From a paper:
A key group of these are the respiratory chain supercomplexes (SCs); these which primarily consist of complexes I, III2 and IV (CI, CIII2 and CIV) in varying stoichiometries, which serve as the minimal functional units for NADH:O2 oxidoreduction. Here we report in situ structures of porcine respiratory SCs, determined directly through imaging porcine mitochondria by single-particle analysis combined with cryo-electron tomography (cryo-ET). Our structures, with an average resolution of approximately 2.5 Å and local resolution up to 1.8 Å in the best regions, enable in-depth study of mitochondrial respiratory SCs in their native states. Our in situ structures also capture numerous reactive intermediates within these respiratory supercomplexes, shedding light on the dynamic processes of the ubiquinone/ubiquinol exchange mechanism in complex I and the Q-cycle in complex III.
The Q-binding site in CI features an unusually long, heterogeneous channel structure. The three other states show not only conformational differences in the Q10 headgroup and the key residue H59NDUFS2 but also long-range structural changes away from the Q10 headgroup and along the whole Q10. State γ is distinguished by housing a Q10 molecule with a headgroup aligned more parallel with the membrane and a contorted midsection of the Q tail. Although the M-distance remains consistent with that in state β, the E-distance is reduced by 3 Å, a change attributable to its silkworm-like undulatory motion. Taken together, our findings support a model in which Q10 progresses through the Q channel by peristaltic motion. In addition, active-apo and all different Q/QH2-binding states were dominantly in the closed conformation (except state β), implying that the closed form may be sufficient for the catalytic cycle.
Residue numbers in the entry:
A (entry chain 1e): 1 to 99
B (entry chain 1A): 1 to 115
C (entry chain 1Z): 49 to 144
D (entry chain 1D): 372 to 430
E (entry chain 1b): 1 to 83
F (entry chain 1a): 1 to 70
G (entry chain 1H): 1 to 318
H (entry chain 1J): 1 to 175
């Protein structure tokens, strides 16, 4: 905040929602509670400048958890491979993938 | 699956109804038959000129009213909380405020028609 | 009359939920095996897919962290029958 | 209302002039004076209470 | 006193609707506090389990929590069964 | 004689009766005699899939009792 | 067979909508020292079919000044909503069981006004615009409480699912617990359908026919079903909402017979009210509701939220 | 096919979004918005946000309803516009429908894309997660927390509507 | 034979029309008030299938009942032109059958037919609420006896 | 027992009109199933019924002939098929058939 | 360019008023067929109403010039076609006055008697169609069955339902048929049990009250100056009635009350007409 | 990023193009003003359902409640644009050019 009163008078107005790893109704965890738990206690009171370099290899692991960016890239590459030999007809899926 | 199947079936049946309605009955159009109806005589000529209705003020307030009916809709699930003391206070706030907004809307003319 | 009946319905809901939680450990005990089995079949088959690839290490964790994550459903039902994935994702949401 | 006739007779077997005071004739002239600020639905109501039939007014 | 009672009577005559709304609306705010079941209502909501009562590891010195979901020790809700 | 009103609502009474009759019987017929399952929550939907998988015939409304297990 | 169910929920309703017209003519007539239609077949039972063929073979008038595309969408939009808003109704077992049934009830009920809206605009006339805008004025006052009464009554049901309404009403009728709300809901359901004291939008004596002035043959015939299928469905909504009958788990016949009879009794009262009272004025209608109805809704909704907590009688969510 | 049904529902959201953003006659734009709003309900309904879909549906019908009343009240012309009549809106119309056509083709054809962000077209079904909700709906239970966790949000929101009626009367007072 | 199916479809169409014709709300003078008595519970026109719908866009038979004058004759023909097809006009009462009492005046058109193609003529001054009750039913017989498709199948 | 009285009264209606076939004829063609007394039958075949205990106006009525002067007068009938001599009695112009 | 107004108020724009012009007729069901009301209204409230009449101008007063006095009688019969006997009563009295001839005592009594059931007819028409135009259709039909009965008395004495042409100068055409008066007594017994039935339907109904109370209110002097008569005077408080002030025929020898209103609005006249019903029953 | 997030984001893009690129109707502009709320509402609802952000599930309606407030006061600006200028087209309001 610019003029921090939430800390001063000691009453929470918006901190409860600011993150997805905070306490949720009936303990419904977020999708990436494990990552946001680790990321938050990684760069806490260490410094915003002293955060983007050291709490990095843990941060993108979280940013991947939200968006599955390179994970979906993996599926696209695999599915792209399927199209390029199924038409060529070298391989057939095992019955596990049919029934 | 079922929901859009139900939706598709209904629009289809309606389309056929208007289709046989608008095609079958052996039309005969002669211009004055298609002329606008004006209670027996000719129209003065407009019907797209701005029809200045007098409930404009009550119109927008209805929009504000609906914006807060959406707010007070989660009450059936809100009652199943562990903090009814807080939930009851905040719930009664909305209705008190909604009445208060109407009360100002009422007392300072407002609801009354414009003449 | 409503106030008595509603409390009775509450009594049933705990009774309903108690049967749910008692049965829950078995349901969790089945789910992990199915997802592990599903992940395996994709990865065992992934060796055949990624044999002729110039550079694709089989079974690489997309995340740097070695802790297991909740597996992403997209790769769970990735190459399964198109009907199966369709029911898997939009099943409940379409069920009626 | 006060239906009245003004009969002028020349003395022959037929009338010479017959003016017909229609109670609705004077009434209907007052439609504008009544319906001042009232809405159209009121005008429908004002017509009904006036009890006008147009045979008498159009003569 | 007389003015206040007359104003109520003048209201009740001129308008019966808002006074009825104001009255029953006014009550809806007050008796929730005076009700002796409101503390029971939160207990009922707390009793209903939506998530699993996840077990916890034993290390001794824990008499309160039971070792079996039939043992006498633990939170019991026979109050709600009769209620 | 007000009886003549009744024939009008009489066929109407049957007319509204058909839908509720149809849905109940169609649900009873398709879902193996048993009343159609309700899935208002993921737990019910998760439960329904388990029944379908263990049914073998890929049909939720095929319940196998203790004779299935040993 | 789900498709067979869909027609079994559409065609039987459609004949029910058809015979409401004959029933209303006879009910209105017999409340008038008249006899009602009794020559078209026996007891006038063939009258709806007689009007059915005439309208669909009637010359469907296309007005030149009308915008044609919007002209045809309105009858389609009116009828399509009327049928599809029957599908979540819990006739013993609802055809479409959804956790948010009443919200879907309001959504297409709110979507319904765009029929009279677009048709009123597309007709391109004075009486067309007068009817359409007073239709706004009639319906603008209308959703604000319709949601509140729905919220207040359902707040002790447990959720927005229509199926669980029967479980709540298993012991006593909902009207015993919220009769002040039921009268107010009933007036609004009498009002949302533009019926009896609130029929300004049509206004035969004052708007000739309102929005329906330039609507003939099937385009008219479609407008009649949307109005009348909404009458039956709204009364059926009220019947489940307030007079939920007993439901045997093994014989859905019992609920179906009881539920249908409740809808018939309520729909007759719609004709009962239609015969008796005069017609309001659209300013008084708005003044009646936002000056007298709406204030009572807020306090009554205030009462119906405080009541479950104070009595420890909150309903189960699941 | 219904497998990319969300791909479809997303599109007609924007064709309707384009149609009314081409600035046709005000009520015609009202139709152009509601079709997008109606299909827009479908996309979020597909993802699980049943309550969110119904509320964006419900109040925007109410929102668009009051818009129509004002359009014909003091915002309509004696010669109304159509999407075809005026060439300016016609040019705006045709530009919108080829803008999506050329792009969704490009996104679907390459499935990698670069514009603004990187997009794997693949399938929106993919990112759904293997999760169980138990006997409670997250989309509805989280909103129910507004009255137990968001007291500040309730106060600020509720207050704002109150001036919302104040301003709606303050500026309309007409001296 | 195609004649049989044409005749069967012939009977189906007209029976719908003759049992559902809607007289407009078009009253003029003395001849209109007693026509209300036809709609009154005594004779109950509605029992015979008719309904008194306004809005000539949704009406079949036009009950020209009363003195047809000069100042309104444009209004009537505009109204008649607005009525969809089929449309019938029953000239009701002696005033609309040629001028009635005021046949020789200066602002009355002598006969409703000079403006509109006038169907079956019911006389009376006024015709009794029953006298044209037959007039309406006699038109129902005229609707019964039409050929339409029979001509079309033989055109 | 008034319920079963009106029930059996309706049963005497169906039996009175020559059985079920006659009942269906008068219902489909005459639109009314009340029985009366044959006060006379004209040369053209129109039966004349009459019932003093009746609301004034329904106390006298005619069942029209099935044949009159060649034209088929099954379901299509009119009011002019009343011969004059019976027109007086039918229209309450006299109480003498 | 131009500097902004130094008081910071721009010159008021020229009027852009676009009030609707609507012709309520001559086909509207409430227009009663021949009423061409061109009214200037903004939105849904009227500002000025120009009542174009003439859609029913039969040259009655012109044609009477060419007919003998006896032949001119049916003109008045057709004039106000809901108060037939009262219409001929006006014309007959004028001709008798000019002829200096009085009708026989029996004639004057049935002229008053039939002139009063004529008041029953018109007031039935006025109140019922009022409710019909307002939107209450049911009260329309219930009386119209009863006023159908009164048309029977019309025809039993004259020959035609509406246009009796019965009240002639010098007395009525011919005596009443035997048993006519008894039939009058039977109906008059039943009628008061229906007039209150109408009052039960509307008089205390809140919807009818709001649609009719304090609406279309006309004061005393303006109503008197406007040439008003009948209910327009008695409704606003002016205690005037020709049957009492200047009694024609034998109206003096009949006791009756004249209902006078106080508010003068639409509602007060509705009671004035309904009360005129019952007062007419005393005259009968 | 999937195509659903894509096509929604692109939707707000031409909503801007509709918004600021103007025309001869202020109503149609404010139509696009509440229109671009659709994209942001639908966009926002997609993430927090996807991320199982239970708390942030109230942020859409809170966003959407404030949404029509702009429209609410926007319509009231229109009416006295009409009250004083009769019409709505955005060229007659230029007296403040000076
Ligand atoms: C958003 C999409 C808008 C698409 C569009 O152009 O709509 C025009 C459409 C027609 O405008 P109109 O005011 O009826 O004028 C039609 C004629 O110009 C004037 O009337 P008309 O009788 O001349 O109409 C016939 C005319 C125009 O065609 C039509 O009217 C047929 C229906 C519209 C077809 C496009 O036919 C042709 O020009 C030849 C067609 C081959 O205007 C709309 O507002 C309809 C939008 C529908 C959107 C989808 C709703 C679901
Ligand atoms: C000025 O002058 C005047 C007159 O005189 C000239 C008069 O006399 C009178 C007196 C007459 C009166 C009757 C008094 C009332 C009249 C007025 C004008 C006063 C004003 C009226 C009102 C305020 C009330 C108006 C009420 C109305 C119109 C009633 C409406 C309701 C009804 C039930 C009646 C109409 C019913 C209809 C049309 C029948 C049903 C409709 C259909 C379309 C038929 C069914 C069709 C289908 C099912 C579709 C086909 C599908 C099928 C068959 C399904 C299978 C096939 C598939 C493919 C699916 C007055 C007042 C007057 O002022
Ligand atoms: C559901 C309804 C099912 C039955 C529908 C039957 C068809 C009715 C169509 C309307 C009347 C026209 C018709 O029957 O044939 C058209 C035919 C078309 O050919 P036509 O030449 O007879 O048309 C009438 C004459 N002109 C062309 C001059 C207008 O018309 C008639 O039959 C009317 C005579
Ligand atoms: C889209 C297309 C859909 C097509 C659906 C198929 C059916 C459509 C038409 C249905 C009616 C066909 C008409 C033939 C029967 C008819 O009306 O006859 C009248 C005609 C009437 O002839 P009329 O016209 O002379 O009668 C009036 C004149 N008076 C009163 C003097 C008699 O009678 C007969 O032919 C005998 C019919 C008796 C039985 C009629 C049906 C009774 C049972 C009804 C049950 C409920 C049904 C719902
Ligand atoms: S025909 Fe006779 S009753 Fe009919 S309007 Fe003319 S004068 Fe009057």
């Amino acid at each position: 905040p610019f003029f921090d009163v939430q800390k001063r008078l000691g009453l929470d107005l918006d901190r409860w929602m600011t993150i997805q790893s905070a306490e949720q109704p009936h303990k419904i965890p977020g999708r990436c509670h494990a990552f946001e738990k680790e990321w938050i206690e990684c760069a806490h009171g260490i410094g915003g400048i002293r955060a983007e370099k050291e709490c990095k290899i843990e941060f993108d692991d979280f940013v991947e958890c939200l968006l599955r960016q390179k994970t979906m890239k993996r599926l696209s590459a695999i599915k792209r491979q399927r199209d390029k030999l199924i038409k060529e007809g070298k391989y057939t899926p095992p019955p596990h993938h049919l029934g | 699956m079922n929901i859009m199947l139900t939706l598709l079936t209904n629009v289809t049946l309606a389309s056929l109804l208007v289709l046989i309605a608008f095609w079958l009955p052996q039309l005969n159009a002669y211009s004055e038959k298609t002329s606008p109806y004006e209670c027996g005589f000719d129209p003065m000529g407009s019907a797209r000129l701005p029809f200045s209705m007098k409930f404009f003020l009550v119109a927008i307030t209805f929009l504000l009213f609906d914006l807060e009916i959406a707010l007070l809709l989660p009450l059936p699930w809100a009652s199943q909380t562990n903090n009814l003391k807080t939930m009851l206070t905040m719930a009664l706030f909305l209705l008190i405020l909604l009445a208060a907004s109407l009360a100002y809307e009422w007392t300072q003319k407002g609801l009354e028609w414009a003449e | 009359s409503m106030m008595k009946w509603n409390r009775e319905r509450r009594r049933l809901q705990i009774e309903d939920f108690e049967a749910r939680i008692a049965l829950m450990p078995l349901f969790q005990a089945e789910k992990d095996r199915r997802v592990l089995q599903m992940l395996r079949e994709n990865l065992e088959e992934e060796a055949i897919i990624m044999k002729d690839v110039p550079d694709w290490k089989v079974g690489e964790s997309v995340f740097h962290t070695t802790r297991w994550v909740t597996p992403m459903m997209g790769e769970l039902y990735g190459l399964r029958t198109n009907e199966e994935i369709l029911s898997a994702t939009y099943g409940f949401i379409w069920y009626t | 209302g006060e239906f009245g006739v003004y009969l002028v007779s020349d003395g022959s077997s037929r009338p010479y002039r017959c003016k017909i005071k229609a109670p609705g004739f004077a009434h209907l002239a007052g439609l504008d004076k009544m319906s001042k600020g009232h809405m159209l639905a009121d005008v429908v109501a004002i017509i009904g209470t006036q009890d006008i039939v147009f045979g008498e007014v159009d003569r | 006193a007389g003015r206040i009672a007359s104003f109520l009577k003048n209201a009740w005559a001129k308008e019966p609707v808002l006074v009825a709304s104001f009255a029953i609306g006014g009550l809806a705010i007050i008796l929730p506090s005076l009700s002796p079941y409101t503390n029971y209502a939160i207990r009922i909501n707390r009793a209903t389990p939506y998530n699993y009562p996840v077990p916890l590891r034993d290390d001794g010195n824990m008499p309160d929590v039971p070792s079996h979901p039939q043992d006498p020790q633990g939170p019991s809700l026979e109050w709600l069964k009769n209620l | 004689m007000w009886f003549e009103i009744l024939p009008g609502i009489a066929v109407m009474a049957a007319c509204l009766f058909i839908p509720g009759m149809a849905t109940a019987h169609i649900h009873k017929f398709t879902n193996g005699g048993k009343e159609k399952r309700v899935a208002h929550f993921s737990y019910q939907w998760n439960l329904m899939e388990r029944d379908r998988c263990i049914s073998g015939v890929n049909r939720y409304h095929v319940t196998k009792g203790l004779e299935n297990i040993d | 067979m789900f498709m067979i169910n869909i027609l079994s929920l559409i065609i039987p309703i459609l004949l029910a909508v058809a015979f409401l017209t004959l029933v209303e003519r006879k009910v209105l007539g017999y409340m008038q020292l008249r006899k009602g239609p009794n020559v078209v077949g026996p007891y006038g039972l063939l009258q709806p079919i007689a009007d059915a063929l005439k309208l669909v073979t009637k010359e469907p008038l296309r007005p030149g000044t009308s915008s044609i595309s919007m002209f045809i969408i309105a009858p389609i939009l009116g009828l399509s909503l009327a049928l599809t808003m029957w599908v979540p109704l819990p006739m013993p077992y609802p055809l479409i069981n959804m956790n948010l049934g009443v919200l879907f009830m309001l959504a297409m009920s709110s979507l319904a006004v765009y029929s009279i809206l677009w048709s009123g605009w597309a007709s391109n006339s004075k009486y067309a615009l007068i009817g359409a805008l007073r239709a706004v004025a009639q319906t603008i006052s209308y959703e604000v409480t319709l949601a509140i009464i729905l919220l207040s009554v359902l707040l002790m049901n447990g959720s927005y699912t229509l199926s669980t309404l029967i479980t709540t009403q298993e012991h006593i009728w909902m009207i015993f617990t919220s009769w002040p709300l039921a009268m107010m809901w009933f007036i609004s359901t009498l009002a949302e359908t533009n019926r009896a004291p609130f029929d300004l939008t049509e206004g035969e004596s004052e708007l000739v026919s309102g929005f329906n002035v330039e609507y003939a043959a099937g385009p008219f015939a479609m407008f009649f079903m949307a109005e009348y299928a909404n009458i039956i469905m709204m009364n059926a909504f009220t019947a489940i909402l307030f007079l939920g009958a007993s439901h045997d788990p093994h014989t859905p016949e019992l609920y179906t017979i009881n539920f249908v009879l409740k809808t018939l009794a309520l729909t007759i009262t719609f004709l009962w009210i239609r015969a008796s009272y005069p017609r309001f004025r659209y300013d008084q209608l708005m003044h009646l509701l936002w000056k007298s109805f709406l204030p009572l809704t807020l306090a009554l909704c205030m009462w119906h939220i405080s009541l479950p907590i104070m009595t420890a009688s909150i309903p189960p969510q699941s | 096919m219904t497998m990319y049904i969300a791909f479809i529902l997303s599109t007609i959201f924007v064709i309707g979004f384009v149609g009314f953003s081409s600035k046709p006659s005000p009520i015609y734009g009202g139709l152009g918005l509601i079709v997008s709003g109606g299909v827009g309900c479908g996309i979020v309904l597909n993802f699980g946000g049943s309550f969110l879909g119904l509320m964006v549906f419900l109040i925007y019908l109410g929102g668009m309803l009051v818009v129509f009343g004002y359009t014909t009240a003091m915002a309509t012309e004696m010669y109304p516009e159509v999407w075809v009549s005026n060439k300016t809106v016609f040019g705006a119309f045709v530009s919108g429908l080829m803008m999506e056509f050329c792009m969704v083709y490009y996104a679907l054809k390459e499935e990698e894309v670069e514009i603004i962000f990187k997009f794997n077209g693949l399938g929106d079904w993919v990112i759904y997660d293997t999760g169980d909700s138990g006997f409670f709906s997250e989309e509805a239970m989280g909103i129910a927390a507004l009255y137990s966790y968001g007291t500040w949000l309730v106060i600020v929101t509720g207050w704002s509507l109150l001036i919302g009626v104040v301003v709606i009367m303050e500026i309309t007072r007409g001296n | 034979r195609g004649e049989y199916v044409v005749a069967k479809l012939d009977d189906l169409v007209n029976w719908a029309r003759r049992s559902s014709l809607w007289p407009m709300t078009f009253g003029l003078a003395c001849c209109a008030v007693e026509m209300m008595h036809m709609a009154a519970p005594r004779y109950d026109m509605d029992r015979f299938g008719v309904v008194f719908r306004a809005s000539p866009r949704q009406s079949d038979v036009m009950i020209v009942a009363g003195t047809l004058t000069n100042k309104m004759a444009p209004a009537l023909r505009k109204v008649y032109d607005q009525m969809p097809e089929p449309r019938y006009v029953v000239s009701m009462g002696s005033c609309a059958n040629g001028g009635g009492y005021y046949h020789y005046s200066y602002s009355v058109v002598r006969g409703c037919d000079r403006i509109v193609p006038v169907d079956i003529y019911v006389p009376g001054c006024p015709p009794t609420a029953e006298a044209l009750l037959y007039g309406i039913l006699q038109l129902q017989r005229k609707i019964k006896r039409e050929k339409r498709l029979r001509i079309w199948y033989r055109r | 027992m008034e319920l079963v009285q009106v029930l059996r009264r309706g049963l005497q209606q169906v039996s009175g009109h020559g059985g079920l076939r006659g009942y269906l004829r008068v219902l489909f063609r005459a639109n009314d199933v009340r029985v009366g007394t044959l006060v006379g039958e004209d040369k053209y075949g129109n039966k004349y019924y009459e019932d003093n205990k009746q609301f004034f106006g329904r106390h006298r009525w005619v069942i029209y002939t099935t044949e009159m002067n060649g034209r088929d007068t099954f379901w299509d009938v009119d009011g002019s098929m009343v011969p004059p001599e019976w027109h007086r009695w039918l229209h309450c112009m006299t109480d003498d058939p | 360019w131009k500097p902004p107004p130094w008081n910071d108020v721009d010159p008021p724009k020229d009027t852009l008023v676009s009030n609707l012009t609507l012709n309520f007729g001559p086909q509207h069901p409430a227009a009663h067929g021949v009423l061409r009301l061109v009214m200037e209204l903004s939105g849904e409230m009227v500002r000025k109403c120009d009542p174009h009449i003439g859609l029913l101008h039969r040259g009655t007063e012109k044609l009477i010039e060419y007919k003998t006095y006896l032949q001119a009688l049916p003109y008045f019969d057709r004039l106000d076609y809901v108060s037939m006997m009262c219409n001929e009563q006006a014309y007959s009295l004028a001709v008798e006055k000019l002829l200096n001839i009085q009708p026989p005592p029996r004639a004057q009594w049935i002229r008053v008697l039939f002139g009063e059931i004529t008041r029953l007819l018109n007031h039935i028409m006025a109140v019922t169609t009022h409710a019909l135009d307002i939107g209450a259709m049911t009260p329309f039909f219930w009386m119209f069955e009863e006023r159908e009965k009164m048309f029977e008395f019309y025809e039993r004495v004259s020959g035609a339902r509406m246009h009796a042409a019965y009240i002639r100068p010098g007395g009525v055409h011919q005596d009443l048929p035997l048993g006519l008066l008894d039939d009058i007594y039977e109906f008059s017994k039943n009628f008061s049990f229906r007039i209150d039935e109408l009052e039960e339907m509307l008089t205390n109904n809140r919807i009818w009250r709001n649609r009719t109370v304090d609406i279309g209110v006309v004061t005393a002097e303006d109503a008197l100056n406007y040439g008003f008569s009948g209910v327009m005077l008695r409704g606003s408080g002016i205690q005037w009635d020709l049957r009492k002030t200047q009694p024609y025929d034998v109206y003096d020898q009949v006791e009756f009350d004249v209902p006078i209103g106080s508010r003068g609005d639409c509602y007060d006249r509705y009671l004035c007409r309904v009360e005129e019903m019952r007062q007419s029953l005393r005259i009968i | 990023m999937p195509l659903v997030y894509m096509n929604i984001i692109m939707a707000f893009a031409i909503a801007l193009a509709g918004l600021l690129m103007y025309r001869s109707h202020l109503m149609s502009s404010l139509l696009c003003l509440e229109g671009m709320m659709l994209s942001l509402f639908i966009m926002s609802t997609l993430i927090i359902l996807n991320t199982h952000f239970t708390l942030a599930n109230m942020m859409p309606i809170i966003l959407l409640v404030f949404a029509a407030c702009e429209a609410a006061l926007g319509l009231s600006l229109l009416v006295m644009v009409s009250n004083t200028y009769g019409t709505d087209y955005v060229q007659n309001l230029n007296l403040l050019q000076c």
